[PDB]
Amino acid sequence: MARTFKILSPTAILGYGFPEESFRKAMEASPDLIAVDAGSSDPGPHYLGAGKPFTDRAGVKRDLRYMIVAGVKNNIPVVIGTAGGSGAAPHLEWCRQIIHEIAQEEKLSFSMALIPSDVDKAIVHQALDNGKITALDFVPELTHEAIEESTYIVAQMGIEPFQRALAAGAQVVLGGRAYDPACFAALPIMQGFDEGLALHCGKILECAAIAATPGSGSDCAMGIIDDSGFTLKAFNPKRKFTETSAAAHTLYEKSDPYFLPGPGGVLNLKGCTFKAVNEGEVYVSGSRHEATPYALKLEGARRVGFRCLTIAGTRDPIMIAGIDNILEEVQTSVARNLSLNDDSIRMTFHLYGKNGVMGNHEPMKTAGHELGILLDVVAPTQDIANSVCSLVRSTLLHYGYENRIATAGNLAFPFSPSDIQSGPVYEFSIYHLIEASDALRFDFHIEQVTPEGVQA
């Protein structure tokens, strides 16, 4: 547009925190927008499936207090994507209630737009039959049964819903599930700044200071968009933006750094340059955007059972050397004792210190002096998971392995009780593109937040 547009990203995910001094210094730079990603699919399917946040309420409330007080005081819009960790209706309502409490504690009044991303199952069913669903790379073909057995289904919104809410005067925009760059890019684009540069800047800012070095998931970053590129900076003398740190975050979590797809188009980065500038800052230029037929990514998860787990160390070299066979013998013993004839009981062991992280892909085939043995059982009911986990635990504890000399017990439990009932287990069930339609439009609702609640 003209001169610059300054975006402040306070933290990698809303709730992760940031140093107060970093945020203060960032505000002294006079941002035009305070924007933050509040959610992700990386933490796994439990959070969408169960309707729960992967972030902390107190943390989210703490971070939002800084952001909303600052935004309202200085007439700077506050824009949040994927409210509540996963951005379905319960996540959006959870974050909405936090913001109401901040307004009641700080005695603030402001307009807030809510943009839900939930998609009714009937829409997905119909789109599947009408040939409007496309699986992403390596995703199984969607079925009606998978749709029906999912819980919350959400669509990742792009810039346009945020823009409509902002154009209506919303001072805080609380979006449901959203394409991460869109939270940052929507406002500068509607003010005339370049779409390719704004979306690329949003991509690099999506995790705040993870794009700086040394990185932090809990520190502030700013992008300053001008008409030829954008400048990146942090607000902590311990951190800098470099050509490597900024380019690293262009690659972050993407399958092709040359072409970044999202709702409404693809970022083409073939012509990009990253150039160190000033002290500890980076200028990015050459990004461009290619419009595509508008489609949205759907996410969904389904419940698959219930989990009970235990954790315990072993320090005995004979047990450690023979551990793989010991665990096989323990499982056989338990199956016989409980007369287990269910193929739907799944016992999983992680042997930390040998192959707990990489499994069959671990290059080191020998453990050291100690193993942390994590056992989890997933079964169709919590009671069955508990029963199997308990019997594996007590059987392993006293199993008489060959050549054993430490004969009073085999396991060091850190906790009383030793077994932990972790509850329902979910798995991803939808990860598919859907062609955009009128039924999939994301519509905003603005409410007036006051120190005494929502006022009509």
């Binding site: 690293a248 690659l251 979590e253 399958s255």
Partner: protein, 105 residues
């Protein structure tokens, strides 16, 4: 002359690219070194597959991103993120086999 990848790379890391894919990012300190590695043709799917105990065809793509002096290796995840039996839900600690890479220049 044997030269380790570790001596050349500023970043060697893994992360998910969505629940179904694992990506490995290698970013070089210098364009000079990135180009030497790229033009050597030694960073092959066969090399990576052997390091990770997978078949060559399991490696989906090796992408040479010149503007970043970076190479990205793309594989499917053999356990969908969060599935029963997973070891690394975020895909964040799958880089160690790359630390053994040595080139011959």
């Amino acid at each position: 002359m044997k030269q380790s990848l570790c001596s050349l790379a500023q970043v060697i890391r893994s992360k998910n690219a969505g629940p179904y894919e694992l990506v490995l990012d290698i970013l070089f300190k210098t364009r000079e070194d990135y180009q030497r590695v790229k033009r050597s043709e030694q960073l092959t799917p066969q090399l990576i597959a052997g390091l990770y105990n997978v078949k060559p065809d399991f490696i989906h793509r090796i992408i040479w991103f010149d503007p970043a002096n970076a190479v990205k290796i793309v594989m499917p995840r053999d356990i969908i993120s969060g599935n029963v039996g997973d070891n690394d839900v975020y895909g964040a600690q799958q880089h160690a086999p790359l630390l053994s890479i040595e080139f011959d220049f």
